[PDB]
């Protein structure tokens with residue numbers, strides 16, 4: 001499907017060269033960054049969405065995640081389905097596991113303090129995570145059946161807000177360098 005949304009945010013640290021490519025294709029080259037997130041996907045997230053992607057290039061040198069990435073409001077929640085990463089596997093408060101799309105993912109919560117959110121400025125908000133137990137190989141057509149994650153999260157008291165914001169397959173980085181090329185559909 002057409003992705004109707006382009007996410008390209010940087011806190012301004014270092015270099016984030018983000019290319020909005022043809023169709024659902026994008027690429028990022030980044031160097032010595034602060035926080036950034038770049039992705040393609042949908043203006044309005046859905047708990048029923050099934051995301052296809054193929055990361056033609058997945059080459060982080062440092063902390064970068066290849067991840068479904070989205071927000072809700074009411075309440076304000078930042079959520080992730082992490083399929084691969086760089087030198088740092090994201091973790092937090094272990095809640096359980098979920099099997100989806102051929103992988104086993106650990107379910108985590110964490111909380112961010114005084115940090116930017118989709119509202120801009122700085123707040124405290126909750127983060128919900130499914131994180132693959134080992135890196136998904138890249139270069140093939142992969143699927144993230146998101147309802148499997150939403151249902152598993154609910155079973156652990158992790159309920160998303162009712163106001164859906166954007167929902168993208170992203171490259172998410174913090175204080176690192178790398179290159180990625182991802183097609184989303």
Ligand SMILES: *[C@H]1OC[C@@H](O[C@@H]2OC[C@@H](O)[C@H](O)[C@H]2O)[C@H](O)[C@H]1F
Pocket residue numbers: 009035036037078112115116117118119120172
């Ligand atoms: C989740 O990832 C990075 C950052 O998210 C951004 O916040 C600012 C907003 O305008 C963008 O749309 C977000 O991607 C957040 O602090 C972090 F915890």
